[PDB]
Amino acid sequence: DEANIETHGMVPMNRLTDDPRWLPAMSERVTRMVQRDRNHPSVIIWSLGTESGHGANHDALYRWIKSVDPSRPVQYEGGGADTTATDIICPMYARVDEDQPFPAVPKWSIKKWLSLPGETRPLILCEYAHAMGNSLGGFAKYWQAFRQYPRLQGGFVWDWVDQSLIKYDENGNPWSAYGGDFGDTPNDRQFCMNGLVFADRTPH
Amino acid sequence: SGIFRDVSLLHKPTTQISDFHVATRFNDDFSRAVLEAEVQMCGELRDYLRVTVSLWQGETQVASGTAPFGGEIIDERGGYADRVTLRLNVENPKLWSAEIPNLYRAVVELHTADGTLIEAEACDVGFREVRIENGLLLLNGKPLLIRGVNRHEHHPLHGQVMDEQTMVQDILLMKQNNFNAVRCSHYPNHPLWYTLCDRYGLYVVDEANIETHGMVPMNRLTDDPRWLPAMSERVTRMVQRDRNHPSVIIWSLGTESGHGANHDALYRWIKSVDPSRPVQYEGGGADTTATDIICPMYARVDEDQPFPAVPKWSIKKWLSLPGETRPLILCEYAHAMGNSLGGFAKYWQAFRQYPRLQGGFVWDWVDQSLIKYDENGNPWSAYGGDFGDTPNDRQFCMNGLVFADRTPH
Ligand code: NA
Ligand code: NA
Ligand code: NA
Ligand code: NA
């Protein structure tokens, strides 16, 4: 269960989440979620949101959940996927054997990530195997690793269903539309379609 | 068998230096060091006795300390009247490493209050700190990458007798081929070996002469308290002999003797007597309670070998097993028997990518072949069984990177 918080477009990404002025707004998105869904057994992990960098507000809210509901681990990928605000190493698109040493927030090979000096947490990708169009190449490599490494406990494919929308031609025939087809601009065209199934749930 | 090592006569005074330990501790950035030297004596105790430990860097005396015998109070019965600890401060010490083997000379003088010398002992001193922190083996605060090799004391003509020329030839070839460490497989070496490693610069794993591979199970003796005495002497007498050599950075409890209670006892003994060096031992699974380092033999890079009780996990997988945090250094890998070393590059790619994978020691340095001569008097290389010896294990004694005569494979 994930809080409705994402400030991806900010520069840097944690500009708001590290600002105490936004702590109240963020806290409500976290605390009200917990108060609402804390009795559902299906919910086994709480998430502070996504792509909002790592701000002090995250640390405060991470602790609030740990204090209010100890029965569920708390995770958050922002700021490097292994910050002090997450109980689980939850990278997005970190590869199996290849490192992507980006400055500040590198994406280490998941196998290498587990044994970095002093690291002991389990690793579960919150996003991996981007299923955009003709994709999922190398998917088998992730599962061989998941099965061989005890602490590599899986991940969440990105994602389930294409976010395409229906439009109609002059004859009333419907067609699948993506970014920009509604005169919307700027737009990121087909990047909204990353699913394993088509919008009508027909499988890719 | 036989008297395969040097024999000599040593004359010592009645009142003598019976033992001395040198230690070097540092501050956070190694900009300052303290050389601590514990000295013991035998003979009659007298107030006029003194010990002076002086540290030299070339012909320049950098530090010196003098004090009468009588250690600090230790327990309800006092202290050691026959011991004294000198402590010397050393600013900006030149650090020792296999890269730059900086050495100082420590001179231990036993003398009277006004300067009459009774006798003097000394050793080469290498200022270096070896420690494991956050899962990494650190040398002077930096994570090592062991480019090691196992080296038996072998000579095609002289057998197991070691000479300076041969030792020097090996060290030069090792360094010329980018090796920075050696393992005394599987016993304390000829004393000159350590002196050469100290001066030329090689990291050394000093190993007790203990191997019971042929027992069934392998720990039948090492887990038997009845064999604790024999085992303890091979470990303790080794530490007492080589503890002042800077090249020795790790103690080994032996090899292929399974894991028994005796190993646990001796592991603790070393940890208590010499906290300056990590202790390792591969028996019983390479990651038992008797080793500070995960030190498997022939564990593969990506492929697991799930043997029961003592599995050899892929080294990358071994590091992150739940609860594991220790560094991993193979005490043996890349068995170089005959046309071999295929897949060697896979190990080094992993060593470089994973911080906690800090290398290993190749098996091994030189073929254990021996020279025999034909009816025409011409020499040829022989192996298992060529001397009538039986049972024997044939060519299995030749696993080196170089031929017995040191010609490279
Ligand atoms: Na797993
Ligand atoms: Na997308
Ligand atoms: Na490494
Ligand atoms: Na062999």
Coordinates of C-alpha atoms and ligand atoms in Angstrom, one line a residue:
Chain A
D1 CA 0.0 0.0 0.0
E2 CA 1.6 3.3 -1.2
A3 CA 1.1 6.8 0.0
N4 CA 0.0 9.3 -2.7
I5 CA 3.3 11.2 -2.8
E6 CA 5.5 11.7 -5.9
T7 CA 7.5 14.9 -6.7
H8 CA 9.5 13.5 -9.6
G9 CA 9.5 16.8 -11.5
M10 CA 11.2 18.8 -8.7
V11 CA 14.8 19.8 -9.0
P12 CA 16.4 18.3 -7.0
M13 CA 13.9 15.5 -6.5
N14 CA 13.8 16.0 -2.7
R15 CA 13.3 19.8 -2.8
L16 CA 9.8 19.5 -1.2
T17 CA 10.3 16.3 0.9
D18 CA 13.3 17.8 2.7
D19 CA 11.3 21.0 3.4
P20 CA 9.5 21.0 6.8
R21 CA 6.9 23.4 5.2
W22 CA 5.7 20.3 3.3
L23 CA 5.8 17.9 6.2
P24 CA 2.2 18.4 7.2
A25 CA 0.9 17.8 3.6
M26 CA 3.0 14.7 3.3
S27 CA 2.2 13.4 6.7
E28 CA -1.5 13.4 5.9
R29 CA -1.0 11.4 2.8
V30 CA 0.8 8.8 4.9
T31 CA -1.1 8.8 8.2
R32 CA -4.6 8.8 6.6
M33 CA -3.6 5.8 4.4
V34 CA -2.5 3.8 7.4
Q35 CA -5.6 4.8 9.4
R36 CA -7.7 3.6 6.5
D37 CA -6.1 0.3 5.4
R38 CA -4.3 -1.0 8.5
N39 CA -6.8 -3.8 9.1
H40 CA -6.4 -5.4 5.7
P41 CA -4.4 -8.6 5.9
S42 CA -3.4 -8.4 2.2
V43 CA -1.4 -5.3 2.9
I44 CA 1.9 -6.6 4.2
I45 CA 4.2 -3.6 3.4
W46 CA 3.8 0.2 3.7
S47 CA 5.4 2.5 1.1
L48 CA 6.1 6.2 1.6
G49 CA 5.5 7.0 -2.0
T50 CA 7.8 7.1 -5.0
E51 CA 10.4 9.2 -6.8
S52 CA 10.5 12.1 -4.4
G53 CA 14.2 11.8 -3.6
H54 CA 15.1 11.3 0.1
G55 CA 14.1 14.1 2.4
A56 CA 14.0 14.4 6.2
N57 CA 10.2 14.3 6.0
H58 CA 10.5 10.7 4.8
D59 CA 12.6 9.8 7.8
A60 CA 10.0 11.3 10.1
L61 CA 7.1 9.5 8.5
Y62 CA 9.1 6.3 8.3
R63 CA 9.4 6.4 12.0
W64 CA 5.7 7.4 12.5
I65 CA 4.6 4.1 10.8
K66 CA 7.2 2.0 12.7
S67 CA 5.8 3.4 15.9
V68 CA 2.1 3.2 14.9
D69 CA 2.1 -0.2 13.1
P70 CA 5.0 -2.5 13.9
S71 CA 3.3 -5.4 12.1
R72 CA 4.4 -4.3 8.7
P73 CA 7.8 -3.4 7.2
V74 CA 8.1 0.1 5.6
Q75 CA 9.9 0.6 2.2
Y76 CA 10.8 3.6 0.0
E77 CA 13.0 3.8 -3.0
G78 CA 13.8 7.5 -3.2
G79 CA 17.4 8.7 -2.7
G80 CA 19.2 5.5 -3.6
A81 CA 16.9 2.6 -2.7
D82 CA 18.7 1.8 0.5
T83 CA 18.4 4.9 2.6
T84 CA 17.5 5.0 6.4
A85 CA 13.9 5.4 5.4
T86 CA 13.4 1.8 4.1
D87 CA 13.5 -1.7 5.7
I88 CA 14.0 -3.2 2.3
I89 CA 16.5 -2.5 -0.5
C90 CA 13.9 -1.7 -3.2
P91 CA 15.6 -0.5 -6.4
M92 CA 13.9 0.4 -9.6
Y93 CA 15.4 -1.3 -12.7
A94 CA 18.7 -2.3 -11.1
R95 CA 20.1 -5.1 -13.3
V96 CA 21.1 -8.6 -12.3
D97 CA 24.8 -8.6 -13.0
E98 CA 25.6 -5.2 -14.4
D99 CA 26.2 -2.1 -12.3
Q100 CA 24.9 1.4 -13.3
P101 CA 27.1 3.6 -11.0
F102 CA 25.2 6.8 -11.3
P103 CA 26.6 9.5 -9.0
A104 CA 24.7 9.8 -5.7
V105 CA 22.1 7.2 -6.5
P106 CA 23.8 4.3 -8.3
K107 CA 21.9 1.1 -9.3
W108 CA 24.2 -1.7 -8.4
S109 CA 23.8 -5.2 -9.8
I110 CA 21.2 -6.6 -7.3
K111 CA 23.6 -9.5 -6.5
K112 CA 26.3 -7.0 -5.6
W113 CA 24.0 -4.7 -3.7
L114 CA 23.1 -7.4 -1.1
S115 CA 26.7 -7.7 0.1
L116 CA 28.0 -4.2 0.1
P117 CA 29.9 -3.6 3.3
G118 CA 27.6 -3.5 6.3
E119 CA 24.4 -4.2 4.3
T120 CA 22.1 -6.9 5.6
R121 CA 18.6 -6.1 4.4
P122 CA 16.5 -8.1 1.9
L123 CA 16.2 -6.8 -1.6
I124 CA 12.9 -6.7 -3.5
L125 CA 12.8 -4.5 -6.6
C126 CA 9.8 -2.2 -6.4
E127 CA 10.1 -1.9 -10.2
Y128 CA 11.9 -4.1 -12.8
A129 CA 11.5 -5.7 -16.2
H130 CA 10.0 -2.6 -17.9
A131 CA 7.3 -4.2 -20.2
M132 CA 7.1 -1.4 -22.7
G133 CA 6.0 -2.7 -26.2
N134 CA 8.0 -5.7 -27.4
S135 CA 9.9 -6.3 -24.1
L136 CA 10.8 -8.4 -21.1
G137 CA 14.0 -9.6 -22.7
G138 CA 16.2 -11.0 -20.0
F139 CA 13.3 -11.7 -17.6
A140 CA 14.6 -15.2 -17.0
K141 CA 17.9 -13.8 -15.7
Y142 CA 16.1 -12.1 -12.8
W143 CA 14.4 -15.3 -11.7
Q144 CA 17.5 -17.5 -11.9
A145 CA 19.1 -14.9 -9.5
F146 CA 16.0 -14.7 -7.3
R147 CA 16.1 -18.4 -6.8
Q148 CA 19.8 -18.7 -6.2
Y149 CA 20.0 -15.8 -3.7
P150 CA 18.1 -16.1 -0.4
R151 CA 18.0 -12.4 0.2
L152 CA 16.9 -11.5 -3.4
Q153 CA 13.2 -12.0 -2.7
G154 CA 11.7 -10.9 -6.0
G155 CA 10.2 -7.7 -7.4
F156 CA 7.3 -6.0 -9.0
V157 CA 7.2 -5.9 -12.8
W158 CA 6.5 -2.5 -14.4
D159 CA 3.7 -2.8 -15.1
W160 CA 0.3 -4.5 -15.4
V161 CA -1.7 -2.6 -18.0
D162 CA -1.1 -0.2 -20.9
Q163 CA -2.4 3.3 -20.1
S164 CA -3.8 3.7 -23.6
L165 CA -7.1 5.6 -24.1
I166 CA -9.9 5.1 -26.7
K167 CA -10.7 7.5 -29.5
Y168 CA -12.8 7.0 -32.5
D169 CA -12.4 7.6 -36.3
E170 CA -15.0 9.2 -38.6
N171 CA -16.8 5.8 -38.8
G172 CA -17.0 5.4 -35.1
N173 CA -14.3 2.7 -35.0
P174 CA -12.3 2.9 -31.7
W175 CA -8.5 3.0 -31.6
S176 CA -5.9 3.1 -28.9
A177 CA -4.4 6.5 -28.2
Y178 CA -1.4 7.6 -26.1
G179 CA 0.4 10.8 -25.1
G180 CA -0.3 13.7 -27.4
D181 CA -3.4 12.2 -29.1
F182 CA -5.7 14.6 -27.3
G183 CA -3.8 17.8 -28.3
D184 CA -2.1 17.5 -24.9
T185 CA 1.4 19.1 -24.9
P186 CA 4.0 18.8 -23.8
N187 CA 3.5 15.0 -23.6
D188 CA 5.6 11.8 -23.4
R189 CA 3.8 10.0 -26.2
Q190 CA 3.8 6.2 -25.9
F191 CA 5.7 6.1 -22.6
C192 CA 2.3 5.6 -20.8
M193 CA 2.1 2.0 -22.3
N194 CA 4.4 -0.3 -20.3
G195 CA 2.0 -3.2 -19.5
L196 CA 2.0 -7.0 -19.7
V197 CA -1.6 -6.6 -21.0
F198 CA -3.3 -4.2 -23.4
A199 CA -5.7 -1.7 -21.9
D200 CA -8.7 -4.0 -22.6
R201 CA -6.8 -6.7 -20.7
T202 CA -5.8 -8.7 -23.8
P203 CA -2.4 -10.2 -22.9
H204 CA 0.9 -9.1 -24.6
Chain B
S1 CA 62.3 -37.0 6.5
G2 CA 65.5 -36.0 8.1
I3 CA 67.2 -32.8 9.3
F4 CA 66.0 -30.7 6.4
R5 CA 66.6 -27.2 8.0
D6 CA 69.5 -25.3 9.5
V7 CA 71.3 -26.4 12.6
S8 CA 73.1 -24.0 14.8
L9 CA 74.6 -23.0 18.2
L10 CA 73.5 -19.9 20.1
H11 CA 75.3 -18.4 23.0
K12 CA 73.2 -16.2 25.4
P13 CA 74.2 -14.6 28.7
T14 CA 72.9 -16.0 32.0
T15 CA 70.8 -12.8 32.4
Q16 CA 69.2 -12.6 29.0
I17 CA 66.4 -11.3 26.8
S18 CA 64.1 -14.4 26.7
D19 CA 61.3 -12.9 24.5
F20 CA 60.1 -9.7 23.1
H21 CA 56.9 -8.6 21.2
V22 CA 56.6 -5.6 18.9
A23 CA 53.3 -3.9 18.2
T24 CA 52.4 -0.7 16.3
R25 CA 49.1 1.1 16.9
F26 CA 47.9 4.2 15.0
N27 CA 45.5 7.1 15.1
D28 CA 42.7 7.6 12.6
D29 CA 44.7 8.8 9.7
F30 CA 47.9 7.0 10.5
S31 CA 49.7 10.4 10.9
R32 CA 50.9 9.2 14.3
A33 CA 51.9 5.8 15.7
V34 CA 53.0 4.3 19.0
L35 CA 55.4 1.4 18.9
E36 CA 54.9 -0.8 21.9
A37 CA 57.6 -3.4 22.8
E38 CA 57.2 -5.9 25.6
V39 CA 60.5 -7.5 26.7
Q40 CA 61.0 -10.5 28.9
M41 CA 64.2 -11.6 30.7
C42 CA 65.5 -14.7 32.4
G43 CA 68.2 -14.7 35.0
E44 CA 68.6 -12.9 38.3
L45 CA 66.3 -9.9 38.8
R46 CA 68.2 -6.7 39.8
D47 CA 67.3 -3.0 40.1
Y48 CA 70.3 -1.9 38.0
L49 CA 68.9 -3.8 35.0
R50 CA 67.4 -1.8 32.1
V51 CA 66.1 -2.3 28.6
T52 CA 66.4 0.2 25.8
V53 CA 64.4 -0.1 22.6
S54 CA 65.5 2.2 19.9
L55 CA 63.9 2.6 16.5
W56 CA 66.0 3.3 13.4
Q57 CA 65.2 4.5 9.9
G58 CA 68.5 3.9 8.2
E59 CA 71.4 5.3 10.2
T60 CA 69.0 7.8 11.9
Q61 CA 67.5 7.0 15.3
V62 CA 63.9 8.1 15.2
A63 CA 62.8 7.2 18.7
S64 CA 64.1 5.5 21.9
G65 CA 62.8 4.4 25.2
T66 CA 64.5 3.1 28.4
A67 CA 63.1 1.6 31.6
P68 CA 63.9 -0.8 34.4
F69 CA 62.2 -4.2 34.7
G70 CA 58.8 -4.5 36.4
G71 CA 55.5 -4.4 34.6
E72 CA 52.3 -2.7 35.6
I73 CA 50.2 -4.4 38.3
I74 CA 48.2 -7.2 36.7
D75 CA 46.3 -8.9 39.5
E76 CA 46.0 -9.3 43.3
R77 CA 49.6 -10.8 43.3
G78 CA 51.1 -7.8 41.6
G79 CA 52.8 -7.9 38.2
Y80 CA 55.7 -9.3 36.2
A81 CA 58.9 -8.2 37.8
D82 CA 60.7 -10.0 34.9
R83 CA 59.0 -7.9 32.2
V84 CA 58.9 -4.3 30.9
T85 CA 57.0 -2.6 28.2
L86 CA 58.5 0.3 26.3
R87 CA 56.3 2.7 24.3
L88 CA 57.7 4.9 21.6
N89 CA 55.8 7.7 19.8
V90 CA 56.4 8.0 16.1
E91 CA 55.1 10.9 14.0
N92 CA 54.2 10.4 10.4
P93 CA 55.5 6.8 10.3
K94 CA 56.5 5.4 6.9
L95 CA 53.9 2.7 6.4
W96 CA 54.7 -0.9 5.3
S97 CA 52.8 -2.7 2.6
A98 CA 53.5 -5.0 -0.3
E99 CA 53.5 -1.9 -2.5
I100 CA 56.1 0.0 -0.5
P101 CA 57.8 -2.3 2.1
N102 CA 58.9 0.5 4.4
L103 CA 60.9 -0.9 7.3
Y104 CA 62.5 0.4 10.5
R105 CA 65.0 -1.3 12.7
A106 CA 64.2 -2.1 16.3
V107 CA 67.1 -2.8 18.6
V108 CA 66.4 -4.3 22.0
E109 CA 69.3 -3.7 24.4
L110 CA 69.5 -5.4 27.8
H111 CA 71.9 -3.4 29.9
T112 CA 72.9 -1.9 33.3
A113 CA 71.7 1.5 34.5
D114 CA 74.9 3.3 33.3
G115 CA 75.2 1.8 29.9
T116 CA 77.0 -1.5 30.1
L117 CA 75.5 -3.8 27.4
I118 CA 74.7 -7.4 28.3
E119 CA 73.2 -8.4 25.0
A120 CA 71.1 -7.1 22.1
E121 CA 68.4 -8.6 19.9
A122 CA 66.6 -6.9 17.0
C123 CA 64.1 -7.2 14.2
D124 CA 62.8 -5.3 11.2
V125 CA 59.7 -3.3 12.0
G126 CA 56.9 -2.6 9.5
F127 CA 54.4 0.0 10.6
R128 CA 51.1 -1.4 9.4
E129 CA 47.6 -2.0 10.8
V130 CA 45.6 -5.0 9.7
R131 CA 41.9 -5.1 10.7
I132 CA 38.5 -6.2 9.5
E133 CA 35.9 -3.5 9.6
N134 CA 32.4 -3.5 8.2
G135 CA 33.1 -6.8 6.3
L136 CA 36.4 -5.7 4.8
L137 CA 40.0 -6.7 5.4
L138 CA 41.8 -3.4 5.7
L139 CA 45.6 -2.7 5.5
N140 CA 46.4 0.8 6.8
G141 CA 42.8 1.6 6.4
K142 CA 42.5 0.5 2.8
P143 CA 40.6 -2.6 1.5
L144 CA 43.1 -5.1 0.1
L145 CA 42.8 -7.2 -3.1
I146 CA 44.9 -10.3 -2.5
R147 CA 46.7 -11.4 -5.6
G148 CA 48.0 -14.5 -3.8
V149 CA 49.4 -17.9 -4.4
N150 CA 50.0 -21.0 -2.3
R151 CA 53.7 -21.9 -2.1
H152 CA 55.1 -25.2 -0.7
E153 CA 58.8 -25.4 0.1
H154 CA 60.0 -27.6 -2.8
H155 CA 63.2 -28.1 -4.7
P156 CA 63.5 -30.6 -7.6
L157 CA 67.0 -31.7 -6.4
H158 CA 67.1 -30.9 -2.7
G159 CA 63.5 -31.9 -2.0
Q160 CA 62.1 -29.8 0.9
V161 CA 65.4 -28.1 1.8
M162 CA 65.1 -24.4 1.2
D163 CA 67.9 -22.1 0.3
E164 CA 68.1 -18.3 -0.1
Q165 CA 68.7 -18.3 -3.8
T166 CA 65.6 -20.4 -4.5
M167 CA 63.5 -18.2 -2.1
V168 CA 64.7 -15.0 -3.7
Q169 CA 64.1 -16.5 -7.2
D170 CA 60.5 -17.3 -6.2
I171 CA 59.7 -13.9 -4.7
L172 CA 61.1 -12.1 -7.7
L173 CA 59.0 -14.2 -10.1
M174 CA 56.0 -13.8 -7.9
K175 CA 56.3 -10.0 -7.8
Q176 CA 57.2 -9.8 -11.5
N177 CA 53.9 -11.6 -12.2
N178 CA 51.8 -9.2 -10.1
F179 CA 51.4 -11.4 -7.0
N180 CA 51.3 -9.5 -3.7
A181 CA 50.6 -12.3 -1.3
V182 CA 51.6 -15.8 -0.4
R183 CA 50.2 -18.6 1.8
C184 CA 52.6 -20.9 3.7
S185 CA 50.7 -24.0 2.6
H186 CA 50.6 -25.7 5.0
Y187 CA 53.2 -25.1 7.8
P188 CA 55.5 -22.5 9.2
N189 CA 58.3 -21.8 6.7
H190 CA 62.1 -21.6 6.8
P191 CA 62.7 -18.5 9.0
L192 CA 64.5 -16.6 6.2
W193 CA 61.2 -16.7 4.1
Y194 CA 59.5 -14.1 6.4
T195 CA 62.6 -11.9 6.4
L196 CA 62.6 -11.8 2.6
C197 CA 58.8 -11.1 2.5
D198 CA 59.3 -8.3 5.0
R199 CA 61.9 -6.7 2.8
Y200 CA 60.7 -7.4 -0.7
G201 CA 57.0 -6.8 0.3
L202 CA 54.6 -9.7 0.2
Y203 CA 51.6 -10.3 2.4
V204 CA 51.9 -13.6 4.3
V205 CA 49.4 -16.1 5.7
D206 CA 51.4 -17.9 8.3
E207 CA 49.9 -21.4 8.8
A208 CA 50.3 -24.0 11.6
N209 CA 51.6 -27.4 10.6
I210 CA 48.3 -29.2 11.1
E211 CA 46.5 -31.3 8.5
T212 CA 44.5 -34.4 9.1
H213 CA 42.8 -34.8 5.7
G214 CA 43.1 -38.6 5.7
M215 CA 41.0 -39.0 8.9
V216 CA 37.4 -40.2 8.8
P217 CA 35.6 -38.0 9.4
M218 CA 38.2 -35.2 8.9
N219 CA 37.8 -33.8 12.4
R220 CA 38.3 -37.1 14.3
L221 CA 41.5 -35.8 15.9
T222 CA 40.9 -32.0 16.0
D223 CA 37.6 -32.5 17.9
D224 CA 39.3 -34.9 20.3
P225 CA 40.5 -33.1 23.5
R226 CA 43.3 -35.8 23.7
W227 CA 44.9 -34.1 20.7
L228 CA 44.5 -30.6 21.9
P229 CA 48.1 -30.5 23.4
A230 CA 49.8 -31.6 20.2
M231 CA 47.7 -29.2 18.2
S232 CA 48.2 -26.2 20.6
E233 CA 52.0 -26.5 20.3
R234 CA 51.9 -26.2 16.5
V235 CA 49.7 -23.1 16.7
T236 CA 51.3 -21.4 19.8
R237 CA 54.9 -22.1 19.0
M238 CA 54.3 -20.6 15.5
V239 CA 52.8 -17.4 16.8
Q240 CA 55.7 -17.1 19.4
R241 CA 58.2 -17.4 16.5
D242 CA 56.8 -15.1 13.8
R243 CA 54.6 -12.5 15.6
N244 CA 57.1 -9.6 14.9
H245 CA 57.2 -10.1 11.1
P246 CA 55.2 -7.3 9.4
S247 CA 54.7 -9.4 6.3
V248 CA 52.6 -11.9 8.3
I249 CA 49.1 -10.3 8.3
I250 CA 46.9 -13.4 8.9
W251 CA 47.3 -16.5 11.1
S252 CA 45.9 -19.9 9.8
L253 CA 45.0 -22.8 12.0
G254 CA 46.1 -25.3 9.4
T255 CA 44.2 -27.0 6.6
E256 CA 41.8 -29.9 5.8
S257 CA 41.3 -31.1 9.4
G258 CA 37.5 -30.6 9.5
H259 CA 36.2 -28.3 12.3
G260 CA 36.7 -29.5 15.9
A261 CA 36.5 -28.0 19.3
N262 CA 40.3 -27.8 19.3
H263 CA 40.2 -25.3 16.5
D264 CA 37.7 -23.1 18.4
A265 CA 40.0 -23.1 21.5
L266 CA 43.1 -22.3 19.6
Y267 CA 41.3 -19.6 17.5
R268 CA 40.5 -17.8 20.7
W269 CA 44.0 -18.3 22.1
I270 CA 45.5 -16.4 19.1
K271 CA 42.8 -13.7 19.2
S272 CA 43.7 -13.2 22.9
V273 CA 47.5 -13.3 22.4
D274 CA 47.7 -11.3 19.2
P275 CA 44.7 -9.0 18.4
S276 CA 46.8 -7.4 15.6
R277 CA 46.0 -10.1 13.0
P278 CA 42.9 -11.8 11.8
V279 CA 42.7 -15.6 12.1
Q280 CA 41.4 -17.9 9.4
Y281 CA 40.8 -21.6 8.8
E282 CA 38.9 -23.2 6.0
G283 CA 38.0 -26.6 7.5
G284 CA 34.4 -27.5 8.2
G285 CA 32.8 -25.3 5.6
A286 CA 35.1 -22.3 5.3
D287 CA 32.8 -20.1 7.3
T288 CA 32.8 -21.6 10.8
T289 CA 33.2 -19.9 14.2
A290 CA 37.0 -20.5 13.9
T291 CA 37.6 -18.0 11.0
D292 CA 37.4 -14.2 10.7
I293 CA 37.4 -14.6 6.9
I294 CA 35.2 -16.8 4.6
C295 CA 38.1 -18.7 3.0
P296 CA 36.8 -21.4 0.7
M297 CA 38.9 -23.7 -1.5
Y298 CA 37.9 -23.9 -5.1
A299 CA 34.5 -22.3 -4.6
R300 CA 33.3 -21.2 -8.0
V301 CA 32.3 -17.7 -9.1
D302 CA 28.7 -18.2 -10.2
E303 CA 28.1 -21.9 -9.8
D304 CA 27.1 -23.4 -6.4
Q305 CA 28.3 -26.9 -5.4
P306 CA 25.8 -27.7 -2.6
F307 CA 27.7 -30.6 -1.0
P308 CA 26.0 -31.7 2.2
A309 CA 27.4 -30.2 5.4
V310 CA 30.2 -28.4 3.6
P311 CA 28.8 -26.7 0.5
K312 CA 30.9 -24.5 -1.7
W313 CA 28.6 -21.7 -2.6
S314 CA 29.2 -19.4 -5.6
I315 CA 31.5 -16.8 -3.9
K316 CA 29.1 -14.0 -4.9
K317 CA 26.2 -15.8 -3.2
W318 CA 28.3 -16.8 -0.2
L319 CA 28.8 -13.1 0.8
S320 CA 25.2 -12.3 1.1
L321 CA 23.9 -15.4 2.9
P322 CA 21.5 -14.3 5.6
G323 CA 23.5 -13.1 8.6
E324 CA 26.9 -13.2 6.9
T325 CA 29.1 -10.1 6.9
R326 CA 32.7 -11.3 6.7
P327 CA 35.1 -10.7 3.9
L328 CA 35.7 -13.6 1.5
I329 CA 39.2 -14.6 0.3
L330 CA 39.8 -18.0 -1.2
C331 CA 42.7 -19.8 0.5
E332 CA 42.8 -21.9 -2.6
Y333 CA 41.4 -21.5 -6.2
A334 CA 42.2 -21.9 -9.9
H335 CA 43.9 -25.3 -9.5
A336 CA 46.8 -24.9 -12.0
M337 CA 47.4 -28.5 -12.7
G338 CA 48.9 -29.1 -16.2
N339 CA 47.1 -27.2 -19.0
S340 CA 44.9 -25.2 -16.7
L341 CA 43.7 -21.8 -15.3
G342 CA 40.8 -21.7 -17.7
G343 CA 38.2 -19.4 -16.3
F344 CA 40.8 -17.4 -14.3
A345 CA 39.4 -14.1 -15.7
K346 CA 36.0 -14.8 -14.3
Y347 CA 37.4 -14.8 -10.7
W348 CA 39.2 -11.4 -11.2
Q349 CA 36.1 -9.7 -12.8
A350 CA 34.2 -10.7 -9.6
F351 CA 37.0 -9.7 -7.3
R352 CA 37.0 -6.2 -8.8
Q353 CA 33.2 -5.8 -8.9
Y354 CA 32.5 -7.0 -5.3
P355 CA 34.1 -5.1 -2.4
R356 CA 34.0 -8.0 0.0
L357 CA 35.4 -10.4 -2.5
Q358 CA 39.0 -9.6 -1.8
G359 CA 40.9 -12.2 -3.8
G360 CA 42.4 -15.5 -3.1
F361 CA 45.5 -17.7 -3.3
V362 CA 46.1 -19.7 -6.5
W363 CA 47.0 -23.4 -6.1
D364 CA 49.8 -23.4 -6.5
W365 CA 53.2 -21.9 -7.1
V366 CA 55.5 -24.7 -8.2
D367 CA 55.2 -28.3 -9.5
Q368 CA 56.4 -30.8 -6.9
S369 CA 58.3 -32.9 -9.4
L370 CA 61.7 -34.5 -8.6
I371 CA 64.7 -35.2 -10.8
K372 CA 65.6 -38.7 -11.6
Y373 CA 68.3 -39.8 -14.1
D374 CA 68.1 -42.4 -16.9
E375 CA 70.6 -45.1 -17.8
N376 CA 72.4 -42.5 -19.8
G377 CA 72.7 -40.1 -16.9
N378 CA 70.2 -37.6 -18.3
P379 CA 67.7 -35.9 -15.9
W380 CA 64.0 -36.1 -16.2
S381 CA 61.0 -34.9 -14.0
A382 CA 59.4 -37.6 -11.9
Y383 CA 56.1 -37.7 -9.9
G384 CA 54.0 -40.0 -7.8
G385 CA 55.1 -43.6 -8.0
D386 CA 58.3 -43.0 -9.9
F387 CA 60.4 -44.1 -6.9
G388 CA 58.5 -47.3 -6.3
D389 CA 56.3 -45.5 -3.7
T390 CA 52.9 -47.1 -3.5
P391 CA 50.1 -46.4 -2.9
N392 CA 50.8 -43.0 -4.6
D393 CA 48.8 -40.3 -6.3
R394 CA 50.8 -39.9 -9.6
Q395 CA 51.0 -36.4 -11.2
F396 CA 48.6 -34.9 -8.6
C397 CA 51.7 -33.4 -6.9
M398 CA 52.2 -31.1 -9.9
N399 CA 49.8 -28.2 -9.7
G400 CA 52.1 -25.2 -10.2
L401 CA 52.2 -22.1 -12.3
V402 CA 55.9 -22.8 -12.8
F403 CA 57.9 -26.0 -13.4
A404 CA 60.0 -27.3 -10.5
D405 CA 63.0 -25.5 -12.0
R406 CA 61.0 -22.3 -12.0
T407 CA 60.4 -22.2 -15.7
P408 CA 57.0 -20.6 -16.2
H409 CA 54.0 -22.6 -17.4
Ligands
NA1 NA 15.8 -15.5 -3.2
NA2 NA 5.6 4.9 -18.1
NA3 NA 36.7 -6.9 -4.1
NA4 NA 48.1 -31.6 -5.4

